[PDB]
């Protein structure tokens, strides 16, 4: 697996919105329970849903897959990720629905040969014979650091007007600033592998012939999320991002490093990995760290200068 | 009077729905599990009604004569029979919600019934 | 006659589903109390030969009296009837004349669930003593039989049904017995009631009626 | 026995989506009465049942057992813990159904040898010769800490949309936050031990040979639960958990620490442990504590750092 | 005298509500849990009333309801309202703030009275326009 | 002693407001989010009070409200006002600035008190002119 | 020690102000944006104090406020003032100028303290004359 936690610093931003009221466009918000020196407070904070990040990642994957030469679906080539949920998607793609349980496996192979996206990100098909497939990449909301008792985050409104010569045209937009964080997981030992139990079916050999390329492309697709390309309203509110701290872990056993809420989440996660290797009878474990805010790390770790080097070494 | 308060809240929700042409506030009100969700809808629906009042698209009238609210939306004319809630009705309704959020579901069901009958006619 | 009192600290609440839609019970039945008592000695076996059939490793304690009451307010939910009462407190009274005081005292420290698996319950303290039998008018909180007469105002008498010990064996249904609970329907609570008990044991400030 | 009480802090999740109405997926909630000077208030609070935790624990146990080498059933190799409940499972596995009461022990031994999960997990077989085996691990519902006169648990709704190029698409998801607490019990003194009265039957020697490995695996399986690998909707709603307080007690007799609701439960459980040992003639009684919220502890306790050390010490 | 003070505070809140056409200050007053929230509303409502006085849209008068009663005339958005009673004195504000420092209940009582005054006046004004 | 310091700062702000007839310094004080804004107002209000002292339009006095209380007389635009209490000492300003360096909340508390003092005095002065 | 230096500079400014009856040097000191303006005031105020010393109108003394405290007596225009504390040493002036070369804020702090000392003394002197 490959797990990670990352910390961003965002200013004058509007990357997610929800239903509007009047001439006001809203920024997404959610509750959070923060433990302060006095007790357990409840606060409201701007959050960015994980599906925006998922959409950005899948779009980048589609681009790379098309550029390299791997198969890509019909609809997904236009950046519409309905995958194969409803019957119309099948009809456009030109595939037959499954008949009964015993045939289900065959379905999953065909859909998994026509579209790399349905492979990496999974899919569902409601109907007589459901065919589930859990995603191979997992993501969660982007909450600002809950360090201390003063959450660094602010949300304000701004006033804009549309010029005209014959008045007969005023709107308000919510803009934010914060120190965001998020964590991600991606298990690369289940890519290009059928996830339904049954007898062997033809074409699995072709699946196995491309495994290296599919895995390499899936790894490269993370450069998008790690560089700062996602969200919306980027035409006129281009945000000013910057990377501060990042921890990535490559292992052979289940693992989940520390959420980046505390100033010391690198040393703790490194020690936890060191002990987990022994306790779980693991064989491989490596930790990469990008540090820009000059916080304590520890000893015996690899320090990378940029994300390009991290992606290169992950691929190698 | 609890039923009279609920009926006046249902009239407010029905006026807001007919004017906005959106069920979203009534859906939020009928699905509320906290005083926060109910109070947020009570503000947002009154804010919609305030815009209709300022535009003279929402007005009180009589239609024996019964109190009513005329609503003009997208060239359609609707008439809701009854009073809108007072500030005291909102406060007493919020106290009822602090005891039992069921009253929000009851008001939402009544509001949707009023709006459906008017839209059918 | 000897008696014991326990102070149980429930974790989130018990659960018991009625026999024969899965509604639950307001308060644990007597059979569950006897079984929870017996658990301490039979920790590790789920089947004992009764000589004709395997019914349960709790048929031994089928001649012990027990009751219980709540010391807080609880909420009954149907979402599989449950009685949510997190961090509450249950008071159970055992009246017995079979084993010595030390046996009952040690057993009373060996209870860790009432109902199903999830119904974890810690034990906070136990008391042991003797009981004096009387037949005069008394005031009680622990539930009693349906056959018991009532002298006070009929206000909080809830009629439920329970099963005799015969239900300890599988493939069989225990006989139905009516019972009366002095409880408030919503919110759940415990209230005292006066009774003209024919056989009641004083157990250290509280009167318990059995018939 | 090994009993424990732990206190969690989860920020943004949907880990148990009971039911679904319209275009909305609903969380699970329970009523709680909070006492006030004016009177009492009924509130609705999120709860995660224990069945999901049991499923996660058994999945981890299967994954570990298949890696050590102990037997694992056929249907259980696929993550479908039906267990030998009806004739179909027996026919698939190939186990002769018990003949009568006397053969119950033989069938129990056979099943216990054929599948690890049926041993630790337990099973019930319906029929003219019913068999039973209570689980050797017990878990309870997860409820937030009813401490003070506030319930630090919020539950909002969120709005999401599926994009399309030919509009003709909307769903809502309930997202919660709270300070969760839960308690667990695990009696390792009954692992790999038949659970019926009768004359011994051939095969118990293998059970005695494998007892050590089975117990070690059972103890290792709790690392996943204590690490936060349960629940659903983990793909697009990855939560952010953290550990605050933990009390783990190992003894030779029934015992269960206090629920972690009050702000001081470590001291109370230590005192009750002393009293219980005194009254039950106990021989072994040890307690480990992890304290990150700076609450009162007492004396006569071992202070660890993370769950890895706790598991190592439990193993030793 | 406590009821007279509460009644005069309720008249001030009702005049401010009818003039501003906004319930927001009365909502804040009736939901107050601290002396800070109450005092902030007492300033903001008097600041609104001060603007109405300077514009001559708020004036004290007497009305015959057969004896003359003190009243306050309010002109807002072409509507005319008349609140019967006195506005609070500086001493009434100070004594009311002392009552709030003992029990914030008195802010809820004044808010409930103010909303009742405003509702009755708004209902009567709408009925006369419909006739 | 913290409440006494806040009360003396509130008296200074109220005297400066009544003398200048401007709420601007009290608005700046109650909206302060930094020690810079608070300190700037503390200088500017004392500079206004210094001019009133030099003109003999601001003077300390005692008033019987049957014991004598310390007060400050303020003459502005032919209006006479009397604020009851002491003005802050240099030590009160320094201790108040230390309280602000810990929590800017104390500037809001002093501003709310100052506006309450000024409003009560202005209301009483307008009522006596109407009579 | 930084606060003691600032306090001794504030005493020098207050003595110079009370003796000259002019706020001009304290105004210049509190508005300084450069080391030049601060140093010029430190010279000019000491030059005023030097004249008062030569005339025996400024003298060091002790006063019982029950222990003896160091003080400076100032006679100006037939008024008598007493400032409690020490005047700065040459080392205090040099260390204060080094503090100003790091942050001119310390001139504003000393000016605010000096004006507080002078105001309190002037208020007390006017009250005793009125009695």
CA distance G46 to G53: 10
D65 Cα to chain A: minimum distance (Å): 12
Q: Which of F85, F99, F128 is nearest to F38 (CA)?
A: F99
Give yes or no for A21 touching B (CB within 8 A).
Answer: yes
CA distance F37 to F31: 9
Does F127 contact E90 at a Cβ distance shorter than 8 Å?
yes
Bridge partners of A31, per DSSP, are A44
Backbone CA torsion sign across D215, D219, D221, D222: positive
| The two three-digit tokens of residue A201, written as one number | 């079916």
CA distance A296 to C185: 59
Q: CB within 8 A of E8, min separation 6: which ones?
A: E85, E86, E87, E88, E89, E92
Does D237 contact A280 at a Cβ distance shorter than 8 Å?
no
Q: CB within 8 A of F54, min separation 6: which ones?
A: none
What would you report as the CA-atom Rg of chain C, rounded to the nearest whole angstrom?
17
Give contacts of D42 with chain B, Cβ < 8 Å.
100
CA distance A38 to A61: 46
| The two three-digit tokens of residue F22, written as one number | 């401007």
Spacing of C-alpha D274 from chain mean position: 26
Spacing of C-alpha C127 from chain mean position: 17
Q: CB within 8 A of A303, min separation 6: which ones?
A: A289, A290, A291, A297
Give the length of chain D.
316
CA distance A224 to A227: 5
Contact predicate F83/F98, CB 8 Å: no
What would you report as the CA-atom Rg of chain D, rounded to the nearest whole angstrom?
23
Please give the DSSP secondary-structure letter assigned to residue B26: H
Give contacts of F127 with chain E, Cβ < 8 Å.
89-90
Q: Which of A202, A223, A206 is nearest to A214 (CA)?
A: A206
Nearest 10 degrees: Cα torsion C59, C60, C64, C66: -50
CA distance A314 to A297: 20
Contact predicate D121/D83, CB 8 Å: yes
| The two three-digit tokens of residue C31, written as one number | 């059979």
**SS3 letters across chain A:** CEEEEEEEEEEEECCCEEEEECCEEEECEEEEEEEECCEEEEEEEECECHHHHHHHHHHHHHHHHHHHCCCCCCHHHHCCCCCCCCHHHHHHHCCCCCCCHHHHHHHHHHHHHHCHHHHHCCECCCCCCCCCECCCEEECCEEECCCCCCCCEEEEEEEEECCCCCCCCEEEEEEEEEEEEEEEEECCCCCCCCCCCCCCCCCHHHHHHCHHHHHHHHHHCHHHHHHCCCCCCCCCCCCECCEEEEEEEEECCCCCCCCCCCCCCHHHHHHHHHHHHHHCCCCCEEEEEEECCCCCCCCCCEECCCHHHHHHHHHC
CA distance G7 to A118: 75
Give contacts of F109 with chain E, Cβ < 8 Å.
36
Does D197 contact C49 at a Cβ distance shorter than 8 Å?
yes
DSSP calls for E66-119 = --EEEEEEEEETTEEEEEESPPPPHHHHHHHHHHHHH-THHHHHHHHHHHHHHH
CA distance A301 to G72: 66
Give the method used.
Answer: cryo-EM
Q: What is the resolution of this structure in A?
A: 3.2
CA distance A12 to A8: 13
CA distance A314 to A300: 18
Q: Which residue has the tokens 């045209």?
A: A169
Contact predicate F88/F12, CB 8 Å: yes
Does F60 contact G127 at a Cβ distance shorter than 8 Å?
yes
Which 3 state secondary structure label does DSSP give C128? strand
Interface C–D counts its CB contacts (< 8 A) at 103
- Collect contacts of A38-44 with beta carbons under 8 A, ≥24 apart: A38/A149, A39/D148, A40/D150, A40/D152, A40/D179, A42/D152, A42/D154, A43/A151
Which 3 state secondary structure label does DSSP give D163? coil
Give contacts of A19 with chain B, Cβ < 8 Å.
24
CA distance D28 to D16: 6
B69 Cα to chain E: minimum distance (Å): 11
Q: Which candidate in C54, C60, C115, C128 is best for mutational testing of the D interface (most D CBs within 10 A)?
A: C54
Interaxial angle between packed helices G105-130 and G90-102, expressed in degrees from 0 to 180 and rounded to the nearest 10: 130
Contact predicate D55/D81, CB 8 Å: yes
Neighbours of chain F (3+ CB pairs under 8 A): E, G
CA distance D169 to D179: 34
Give contacts of D143 with chain C, Cβ < 8 Å.
12, 86
CA distance G55 to F16: 38
Contact predicate A75/D158, CB 8 Å: no
Judged on CB neighbours under 10 Å (0-12, 13-18, 19+), D279 is middle
Q: Which of C38, C57, C9, C32 is nearest to C96 (CA)?
A: C38
Spacing of C-alpha C157 from chain mean position: 17
Contact predicate C107/C64, CB 8 Å: no
Give contacts of C113 with chain D, Cβ < 8 Å.
138
CA distance A253 to A284: 9
| The two three-digit tokens of residue B34, written as one number | 């906290």
CA distance A3 to A11: 27
Backbone CA torsion sign across D215, D221, D223, D228: negative
- Asked whether B and D share 3 or more beta-carbon pairs under 8 angstroms, the answer is yes
DSSP H or E stretch at residue D44: strand D40-46
First to last CA, chain F: 40
Give yes or no for D41 touching B (CB within 8 A).
Answer: yes
Q: How far is CA D262 from CA D5, D177, G22, in A?
A: 12, 19, 66
Give contacts of F122 with chain E, Cβ < 8 Å.
90
Q: How far is CA C166 from CA A40, C55, C60, C96, E6, in A?
A: 52, 10, 12, 20, 71
A248 Cα to chain D: minimum distance (Å): 16
φ, ψ (nearest 5 deg) of residue D205:
-65, -40
Contact predicate D31/D218, CB 8 Å: no
Does F120 contact E90 at a Cβ distance shorter than 8 Å?
yes
Interaxial angle between packed helices F105-130 and F2-20, expressed in degrees from 0 to 180 and rounded to the nearest 10: 50
| Torsion-angle region of G21 (φ positive above 0: left; ψ -120 to 50: alpha; else: beta) | left
DSSP calls for D214-246 = HHHHHHHTHHHHHHT--SS-TTT----EEEEEE
CA distance D193 to D130: 19
Contact predicate E54/E48, CB 8 Å: no
In this complex, the residue of D28, D35, D254 whose CB is nearest that of residue C112 is: D254
Judged on CB neighbours under 10 Å (0-12, 13-18, 19+), A38 is exposed
CA distance G31 to G45: 15
CA distance G44 to D213: 91
Spacing of C-alpha F60 from chain mean position: 13
Does D29 contact B34 at a Cβ distance shorter than 8 Å?
no
What would you report as the CA-atom Rg of chain E, rounded to the nearest whole angstrom?
14
Cβ count within 10 A of residue A94: 8
Give the length of chain C.
211
Q: How far is CA D236 from CA A30, A230, C146, D53, D232, in A?
A: 16, 15, 56, 20, 10
Give contacts of F119 with chain E, Cβ < 8 Å.
42-43, 46, 90, 93
Q: How far is CA G81 from CA D190, F89, G19, G75, G128, in A?
A: 93, 17, 9, 6, 12
Interface E–F counts its CB contacts (< 8 A) at 32
What would you report as the CA-atom Rg of chain G, rounded to the nearest whole angstrom?
14
Give yes or no for C78 touching D (CB within 8 A).
Answer: no
Spacing of C-alpha E62 from chain mean position: 17
Does A31 contact D177 at a Cβ distance shorter than 8 Å?
yes
CA distance A39 to D293: 10
Backbone CA torsion sign across E100, E103, E106, E112: positive
Contact predicate C115/C39, CB 8 Å: no
Longest Cα–Cα distance in chain D:
76
In chain B, residues 38-97 whose CB comes closer than 8 Å to chain D: none
CA distance G27 to C48: 100
Longest Cα–Cα distance in chain E:
47
Does B88 contact E126 at a Cβ distance shorter than 8 Å?
no
φ, ψ (nearest 5 deg) of residue D272:
-65, -35
What would you report as the CA-atom Rg of chain A, rounded to the nearest whole angstrom?
22
Judged on CB neighbours under 10 Å (0-12, 13-18, 19+), D213 is middle
CA distance G55 to A298: 70
Question: Residue C205: how many CA atoms within 13 Å on its side-chain side?
Answer: 2
Interaxial angle between packed helices B87-99 and B102-120, expressed in degrees from 0 to 180 and rounded to the nearest 10: 130
Judged on CB neighbours under 10 Å (0-12, 13-18, 19+), F56 is exposed
Bridge partners of B73, per DSSP, are B76
Return the residue of D nearest to C122 by Cα.
D256
Which 3 state secondary structure label does DSSP give G57? coil
Does D155 contact B98 at a Cβ distance shorter than 8 Å?
no
Q: CB within 8 A of E54, min separation 6: which ones?
A: none
CA distance C37 to C110: 8
| The two three-digit tokens of residue D107, written as one number | 């069938």
Contact predicate E15/E87, CB 8 Å: yes
Give yes or no for B22 touching D (CB within 8 A).
Answer: no
Does B98 contact D24 at a Cβ distance shorter than 8 Å?
no
CA distance D244 to D229: 17
DSSP calls for B57-72 = SEEEEE----EEEEEE
A22 Cα to chain B: minimum distance (Å): 8
φ, ψ (nearest 5 deg) of residue C28:
-60, 145
CA distance A300 to A269: 13
Q: Which of A86, A190, A18 is nearest to D157 (CA)?
A: A18
CA distance A111 to A115: 7
φ, ψ (nearest 5 deg) of residue F9:
-65, -45
φ, ψ (nearest 5 deg) of residue G129:
-70, -35
Cβ count within 10 A of residue C40: 18
Bridge partners of C183, per DSSP, are C190
| Bond prior to A311 in cis (omega within 30° of 0) | no
Q: Which residue has the tokens 């208020």?
A: G123
CA distance G65 to G84: 9
φ, ψ (nearest 5 deg) of residue C145:
-80, 165
| Torsion-angle region of F87 (φ positive above 0: left; ψ -120 to 50: alpha; else: beta) | beta
First to last CA, chain A: 15
Spacing of C-alpha A191 from chain mean position: 16
Q: CB within 8 A of D160, min separation 6: which ones?
A: A49, A51, D170, D171, D172, D173
CA distance B6 to B110: 9
**SS3 letters across F45-95:** HHHHHHHHHHCCCEEEEEEECCCEEEEEEEEECCEEEEEECCCCCHHHHHH
Give contacts of B28 with chain D, Cβ < 8 Å.
157
Judged on CB neighbours under 10 Å (0-12, 13-18, 19+), F108 is middle
CA distance C87 to C8: 10
| The two three-digit tokens of residue B57, written as one number | 């698209």
Give the length of chain E.
131
Which 3 state secondary structure label does DSSP give D250? strand
Contact predicate C113/D138, CB 8 Å: yes
CA distance D96 to F116: 90
CA distance C43 to C24: 27
Spacing of C-alpha D78 from chain mean position: 20
Question: Residue C155: how many CA atoms within 13 Å on its side-chain side?
Answer: 9
Contact predicate G127/G119, CB 8 Å: no
CA distance C135 to C195: 10
């Amino acid at each position: 697996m490959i797990s990670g936690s990352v910390r961003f610093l965002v200013n004058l931003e509007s990357l997610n919105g929800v239903e509007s009221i009047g001439n006001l466009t809203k920024h997404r918000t959610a509750p959070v329970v923060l433990k302060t020196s006095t007790g357990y407070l409840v606060r409201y904070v701007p959050v960015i849903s994980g599906e925006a990040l998922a959409h950005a990642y899948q779009a980048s994957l589609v681009d790379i897959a098309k550029k390299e030469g791997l198969p890509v679906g019909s609809l997904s080539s236009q950046y519409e990720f309905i995958k194969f949920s409803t019957d119309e998607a099948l009809k456009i793609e030109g595939i037959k629905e499954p008949k009964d349980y015993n045939d289900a496996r065959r379905f999953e192979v065909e859909v998994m040969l026509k579209d790399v996206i349905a492979d990496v990100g999974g899919f569902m098909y409601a109907g007589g014979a459901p065919v589930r497939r859990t995603s191979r990449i997992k993501l969660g909301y982007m909450i600002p650091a809950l360090r201390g008792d003063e959450i660094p985050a602010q949300l304000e409104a701004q006033f804009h007007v549309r010029f005209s010569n014959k008045p007969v045209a005023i709107f308000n937009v919510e803009v934010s600033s914060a120190l965001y964080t998020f964590s991600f997981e991606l298990d690369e030992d289940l890519i290009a592998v059928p996830s339904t139990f049954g007898e062997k079916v033809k074409g699995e050999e072709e699946l196995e012939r491309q495994k290296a390329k599919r895995v390499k492309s899936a790894i490269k697709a993370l450069y998008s999320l790690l560089s700062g390309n996602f969200g919306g309203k980027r035409s006129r509110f281009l945000p000013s991002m910057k990377l501060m701290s990042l921890v990535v872990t490559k292992t052979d056993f289940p693992f989940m490093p520390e959420p980046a809420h505390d100033d010391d989440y690198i040393k703790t996660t490194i020690m936890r990995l060191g002990k987990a290797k022994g306790v779980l009878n693991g064989n491989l474990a490596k930790a990469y760290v990008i540090n820009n805010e000059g916080i304590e790390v520890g000893e015996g770790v690899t320090v990378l200068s940029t994300v390009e080097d991290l992606v290169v070494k992950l691929e190698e | 009077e609890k039923e009279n308060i609920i009926g006046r809240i249902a009239n407010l929700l029905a006026v807001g729905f007919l004017y906005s042409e959106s069920p979203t506030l009534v859906d939020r009100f009928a699905n509320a599990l906290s005083k926060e969700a109910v109070t947020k809808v009570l503000y947002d629906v009154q804010r919609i009604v305030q815009m209709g009042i300022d535009r003279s698209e929402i007005a009180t009238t009589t239609i024996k004569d019964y109190p009513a609210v005329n609503v003009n939306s997208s060239g359609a004319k609707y008439t809701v029979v009854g009073y809108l809630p007072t500030s005291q009705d909102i406060e007493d309704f919020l106290r009822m919600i602090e005891e039992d959020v069921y009253y929000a579901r009851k008001a939402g069901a009544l509001a949707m019934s009023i709006a459906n009958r008017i839209k059918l006619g | 006659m000897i008696y014991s009192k326990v102070f149980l600290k429930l974790h989130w609440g018990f659960s018991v589903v009625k026999p024969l839609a899965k509604p639950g019970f307001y308060l644990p039945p007597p059979t569950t109390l006897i079984g929870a008592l017996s658990y301490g000695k039979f920790r590790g076996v789920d089947n004992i030969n009764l000589g004709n059939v395997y019914g349960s490793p709790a048929y031994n304690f089928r001649n012990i009296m027990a009751t219980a009451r709540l010391e807080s307010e609880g909420v009954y939910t149907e979402d599989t009837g449950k009685v949510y009462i997190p961090n509450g407190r249950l008071v159970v009274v055992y009246v017995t004349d079979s084993i010595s005081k030390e046996e009952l005292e040690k057993l009373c420290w060996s209870i860790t669930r009432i109902g199903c698996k999830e119904c974890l319950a810690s034990v906070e303290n136990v008391e042991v003593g003797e009981a004096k039998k009387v037949s005069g008018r008394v005031k009680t909180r622990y539930y009693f039989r349906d056959t018991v007469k009532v002298v006070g105002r009929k206000e909080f008498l809830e009629y439920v049904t329970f099963w005799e010990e015969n239900g300890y064996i599988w493939g069989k249904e225990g006989s139905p017995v009516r019972y009366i609970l002095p409880i408030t329907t919503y919110p759940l609570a415990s209230k005292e009631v006066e009774v003209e008990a024919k056989e009641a044991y004083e157990v250290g400030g509280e009167y318990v009626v059995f018939s």
